[PDB]
Amino acid sequence: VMTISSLEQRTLNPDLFLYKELVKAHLGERAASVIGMLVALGRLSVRELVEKIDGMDVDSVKTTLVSLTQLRCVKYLQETAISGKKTTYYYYNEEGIHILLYSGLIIDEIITQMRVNDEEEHKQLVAEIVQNVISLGSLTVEDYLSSVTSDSMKYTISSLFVQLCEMGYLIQISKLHYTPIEDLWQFLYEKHYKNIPRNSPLSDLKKRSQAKMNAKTDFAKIINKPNELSQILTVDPKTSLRIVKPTVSLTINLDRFMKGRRSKQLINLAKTRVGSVTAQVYKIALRLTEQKSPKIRDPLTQTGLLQDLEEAKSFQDEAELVEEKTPGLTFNAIDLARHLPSASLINSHLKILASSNFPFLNETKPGVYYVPYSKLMPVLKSSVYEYVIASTLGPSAMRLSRCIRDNKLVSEKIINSTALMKEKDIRSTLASLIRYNSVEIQEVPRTADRSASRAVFLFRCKETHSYNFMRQNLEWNMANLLFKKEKLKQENSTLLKKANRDDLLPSELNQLKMVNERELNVFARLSRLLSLWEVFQMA
């Protein structure tokens, strides 16, 4: 019926769907459909692909596979069973194509390092750098700068140079680095039950906890090995100053893009509940401490290991106090009052830190002006969701959905009491909500076994399902919006390549601005939705 329906393209593709359009909208061709198989069908082996895609065996698979790997679009492992030989298993890389999915706000990450050089081709320079770096995947300043012209100013060219370090940009990607975290927890969970020097036969507990402990502490430096090591930072060659190790291949570490994009959201939450001035103080206050907060890195092994009715807590509370403690000494006791506009006498203007009270910050060593951190984010994140259904379901929806938050599993009779309106409204702004999930239902039978009109109903939250009703936001228009970008490319499909290789006509000029402002809208959307989506996937 009319095909403008747009159901096939719509409903039946969750999760996986985003990827195989992204790569399709990005790499495309055969290079895409492989990942579509790879996500959907799980871990997969080189030969086994060809039994399905019909992709001309060991041709596309190999070529497109490495075509992904330098862009790290796959998770990569190889090993052998006890029989012998060897085999390779794969996955869809991490968040992976995610790197592509932003790439614009990764362009915006200039603004942080943008300081000390403003309104320059130096801007355009480092932009050209990064937009070449992600596109080309792994880079080396030796091969890149080598391809870059000679007879210019080396330490002036490199832009980053002494900057390559910062928090973001790049790190060596080393071997098992992008070997999947979950599985390297298994390989490292060897060596411990694997090596038990016949300690005692009794108490597998002494075998167990020690293993996990050994598994934890040995894992610690594993992610910290790439985190920072001076092999990059320290080197200072002859006739020069401190250099990186351009001998090494590096790739953008998205964790400090996680942190960076996120701290902006922590702002826009704070830029509400305080005054714009002290807000700005909070705005730069993160810039110093936005380094060491694990943030989207802290979940880490929260994936891959069975949780516990206890040990899961001993994992939580560990993340609660940790860096608020040791990096707490890296965190803000007395700031430099870095730049600031406020002016004249600037010090008590700084004492305003206490003006932040609820619902975040506002904890310290007793009376040095300071903020909690590793515990902050947990007591911060949980309350980052804010209004996710405002100007979508109507404001009336908030008040009771907010009310359902305070108490729990509450019945509409007393919802009609605490909250208030003619029931004629509740049965809309509530019932209309439940279709979008959130509230769900509790129900209990009364004076019946279980029946139709023989019981009472209660309403609850289950914020998991709530906080999960917005992962449709992934499948939502990040589904459609990206099509919009693609399926319109066919309007000028013959005109596009004409306009690219031409640099005329009335109708050519006619729809240029049309399709273009069109685009700039579709990516404006993508930026907005992206900014919202920045929350629910982690933190």
Binding site: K424, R427, S428, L430, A431, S432, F457
Partner: protein, 98 residues
Amino acid sequence: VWTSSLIKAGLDKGISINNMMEHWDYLQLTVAMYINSDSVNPAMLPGSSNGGGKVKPIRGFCQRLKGKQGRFRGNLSGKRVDFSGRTVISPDPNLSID
């Protein structure tokens, strides 16, 4: 269609949570009632076009595909035939074999 568009016009403005889930339930009982036998009358009571006469043969569905000769057994593997004939018999020995 009826008990649906009820809930469709319902849940938009009027009705209520307790006067909803028994409808949507009743929907569940029709649509499953539709394709199989199972539930008959666990004191659920009927909808449109009943009269309240306690009529047991309520289905022309899963049964038409299932047992006896509805279809599967009798009307498909057992197809009634064409170009045929039936009659009583009488001997004719002056006629050969075959």
